[PDB]
Symmetry: D2
Subunit: 267 residues, 4 copies
């Protein structure tokens, strides 16, 4: 049987490595994107060239805002999330794995309309959208006759090993990852009767090159105890792939740091 | 005369905190949403004990616009009310909180959206804006006239790490509130504003034998004072080196397993 | 008149805790190992303030036999000393602790063995036996005459989760002490004995700019009182619902990263 | 190249599944035992029959006590630990992985000579021995010319997902696993310059059958959220095997619970 994975924010960086890793194990993957349409579609062609009808793309703004319909009233985040899960059942009749990877990240310093949009985008992508996606995912397994349910349902939330040692100026982001840790434990307990495992993976510093200038990149990366560098995308994605595997079937409600020991440091 | 702003101060733990802060000598702003009678009464009682020592401000802390006025603005006005009235705000206790189920399994969408805005707003988004407004006011006060003992206390939950079945949005919001405690504690340290949490286990359940009987210490839920006295302590000059920490007040219930 | 047993009470934080407990009215047993002069002096000062309010007992708390006498026996005698003298022991503060490096990399074996016995004994094995002896005495006292406020405070470390390079045995012993706090808090709940921890960050470093300057709140280490006042609070009847918990007193240093 | 793993307490149950799992990946394994000599030696024959010269056995009491020499003065735990690591270099010239699995577990209620032996056995097996074994392991890699060091050194400590919700009456055991968590973080930081990763795996309830009578076994196992049963030995060992793999190379200083969500419960 060919299981299916829905990966949010899958066009590049960590999300693309998670989609590639799952595809390498045999999963058909639904690649969600927000602004990186070209990149998502290129990845999709690359995957379908390797194995036909093994990848599809779907667009969505996961911020906690209402959007205009694509054909009466404004569409809610809840609906958009339900439609992402639906795309998987419509195309392949199942959704075995959900990886909540999409996430906005920018400052919200404590010391007008921008603040409201930042709250909805940072909390929606990192926490409210994952909540609605898990709810739609669980509803679809619950509506599937037991004799037709898959045998290895897994949800992975991408959290952050370092949020307990806050990055100064990123309060809303930090709060939203703490809510995501709370969703991981609450959903793991609640969904355990359906055999749906829910776990987190929390990178420390990963693929810094694209986000920081040389000198800043060098300076951050030097404080990681193990290897004195940021991780590669595969160093993170291989752990997500292992948690979705049948070998990790007794693991639920846990968050695994993939941080090279950065959380063990002190100023 | 120091000033304390207590959210959800009309009754139960919020009332107990206001009383305790009032006994150490603070002037207290009693925020309420639906409990106007109870709020006004408490205020009258406190003013009877010591004139012009209590006021009341109403506000919905759900993350919704009202007749428009955003949540932020409402939060800022609550902080502005302490200044306007008494010219200062030294303590802030984020206690108001909605709490009911949001089951993952089994007009409905609109109610779901109201529930996320109410549970997330009261437990996390409002506390954030309140913290941001409190900070902005301390920063704007010339160093020479600042208070010497600014403390912000967030009421968390000792048991959210062992989730209550069917309360996901609430649990997620308390997790966001723990994050806010650590982040604001770090960022507001230069202004000497301490930010800490207090996490009750089972408290004032009546205001049940199945639940109470599982608490290791005393086999009962706590009284309101058993929690507010901890909150007053954290606000005292003696807990001056304590910041970014959450103190459980749960009789050992978090030490238990099924 | 309640009685407190403070280990490593001769100076620094231990001295500050004894002073603070003495000011709330407790009779205090001042344990010491090598600091006889300082211990005896403190005792004289306290007895000058209030007659027959302080004593001194010497004991090595390393996990070694002495001239044989085991550590357990020595621990039991320390508890027996409070009873013998004043007929009661209501509070126990496990503060004594050895702290020096045990590097993983780069007669030697005998010194390694002395180091494990001293660091593990003082920070964890002694506290265990002391707790076991304290419990045994409360259990043996007819319910009718027990105290009404038994508290055991273990001095932990807010920063052991971000280890100091080269102090493995010490870090492991503080981890064992956190375990003891939770286990004894759960097991001693029926006898109403509370067991909690207090974890300093950087305190009384002189009794350094590199270290101090990294503390978010105040950019300095704490004073002794900034830590002992927390310990006295936990021992007070007002923190009666608090059990099995560790309170950090670190100025936010545990919130930092390299 | 054939890497070597030293597994303590490897004769049965979880330890034997960890040794079997590592051997299946190609490692030569040194099987340490204390009282289960016959069982250790049988496993050793089974492994060597599958692949010659791939398994050896070594005996040792890991309690923090001195023992009589096997040929002047009484031998210390430190020496016995160093000799376990030495056995691997003597036989195969290397020791790539160390799994600290051996552990005593029995009550030490708070409410004569037995207490001293319990303290040394419970703290030695669960914490002091792991400390000395890691120290000997690190010393041997440090003494190996860099050009000859292996490329994937990993130490795994078996901890306990449930020690933060203490089992009534097991104080010394609980304290010793807390010290083992402290050793995991301290050693991960200190050894990171040598690229030696140190992580923990913490089962919840596993292979209960042998340790509990039917009715008690049934009652405990029913409180696990996921599956309402205790785990199998492989459900735990597959996670240890994954953490020793090159795919887990950016993970250090972390403890992964394998508990079916049991730590998420409350009384
Ligand atoms: N990189 C690192 O060091 C760290 C990573 N993590 C976590 O790992 C995960 C992956 O990290 P990384 O690859 O760096 O993440 P990115 O910052 O690269 O974001 C991944 C994607 O999320 C999407 N996204 C952002 N906002 C929205 C939105 N409003 N609606 C829908 N999608 C949105 C984007 O899609 P598009 O481009 O299509 O718009 C983007 O490509 C994240 O959850 C992150 O928080 C945690 C700690 C560190
Ligand atoms: N009680 C317990 O066992 C526990 C409590 N806690 C925490 O302690 C704190 C106090 O607990 P408790 O006293 O039980 O709290 P309540 O359930 O009694 O609520 C306190 C108050 O908050 C207010 N509130 C609710 N929704 C809103 C809203 N949308 N806008 C503004 N105000 C709102 C109410 O005001 P009004 O009545 O005026 O409308 C209410 O009186 C809470 O943060 C709670 O999560 C943690 C764990 C356990
Ligand atoms: N100071 C700090 O920054 C921090 C302290 N803490 C903790 O707070 C507590 C108090 O700290 P601090 O005041 O610095 O402690 P110290 O380093 O000053 O030691 C306190 C005392 O413990 C005693 N002691 C040491 N070894 C033994 C032994 N083998 N047997 C009996 N007694 C012994 C000593 O007694 P004598 O002098 O009479 O021999 C000594 O005065 C400790 O548990 C410590 O780990 C935690 C983090 C930081
Ligand atoms: N089973 C479970 O539910 C749980 C397991 N864990 C942990 O997982 C690991 C494996 O668990 P499990 O298989 O149940 O363990 P066992 O209790 O079966 O013990 C494993 C082995 O440890 C050895 N051992 C005990 N004392 C000593 C000693 N003094 N010196 C040397 N070796 C000694 C034994 O060797 P021999 O037989 O050769 O004497 C024994 O076979 C342990 O660290 C345990 O604490 C944690 C939580 C739950
Ligand atoms: C660790 N990290 C990498 C990084 C890149 N993309 C991500 N994307 C998401 N969704 N989540 C992350 N955690 C994330 N992290 C970082 C960390 C700090 C700064 C940095 O400090 N940047 C600010 C400035 C710092 C400040 O506000 O003081 C900037 O915008 O330049 C950048 C990237
Ligand atoms: C601790 N608590 C009291 C209580 C009362 N008011 C509060 N108010 C707020 N704001 N926050 C709280 N945590 C809170 N807690 C509890 C604890 C357990 C259950 C109980 O087990 N309840 C469920 C079961 C859930 C379900 O199956 O729907 C329920 O329906 O409430 C209720 C209240
Ligand atoms: C917080 N502290 C003060 C201090 C003083 N006495 C104590 N006494 C006890 N019992 N426990 C403590 N934690 C303690 N702490 C510190 C903190 C850092 C360093 C410091 O960085 N030191 C190293 C570096 C280690 C090395 O490379 O060997 C050292 O040699 O002590 C020293 C003392
Ligand atoms: C979860 N577990 C399985 C089990 C079996 N072997 C192990 N072996 C080790 N080394 N470590 C473990 N954690 C471990 N755990 C348990 C848990 C409780 C009891 C049980 O309660 N046993 C006591 C009695 C309980 C009590 O003392 O009150 C007994 O000896 O019968 C037994 C096994």
């Amino acid at each position: 049987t060919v299981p299916v994975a829905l990966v949010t924010g899958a066009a590049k960086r960590l999300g693309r490595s998670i989609a590639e890793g799952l595809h390498a194990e045999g999963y058909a993957v639904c690649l969600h994107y927000h602004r990186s349409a070209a990149e998502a579609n290129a990845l999709s062609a690359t995957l379908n060239a390797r194995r036909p009808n093994s990848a599809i793309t779907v667009q969505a703004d996961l911020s906690n805002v209402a959007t205009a319909p694509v054909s009466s009233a404004p569409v809610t985040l809840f609906t958009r999330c339900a439609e992402l899960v639906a795309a998987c059942y419509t195309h392949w009749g199942r959704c075995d794995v959900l990886v909540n990877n999409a996430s906005s990240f920018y400052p919200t310093p404590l010391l007008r309309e921008a603040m409201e949009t930042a709250t909805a985008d940072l909390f929606g992508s990192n926490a409210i959208a994952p909540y609605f996606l898990i709810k739609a995912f669980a509803h679809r397994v619950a509506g599937t006759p037991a004799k037709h349910r898959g045998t290895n349902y897994s949800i992975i939330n991408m959290v952050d090993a370092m949020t307990n040692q806050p990055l100064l100026g990123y309060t809303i982001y930090t709060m939203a990852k703490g809510a995501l840790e709370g969703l991981t434990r609450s959903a793991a307990l609640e969904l355990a009767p359906l055999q749906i495992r829910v776990n987190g993976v929390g990178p420390g510093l990963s693929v810094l090159v694209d986000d920081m200038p040389p000198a800043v990149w060098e300076g951050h990366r030097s404080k990681v105890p193990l290897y004195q560098r940021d991780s590669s995308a595969a160093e993170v994605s291989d752990v997500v792939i292992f948690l979705c595997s049948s070998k990790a079937k007794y693991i639920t409600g846990t968050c695994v740091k993939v941080d090279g020991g950065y959380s063990l440091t002190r100023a």
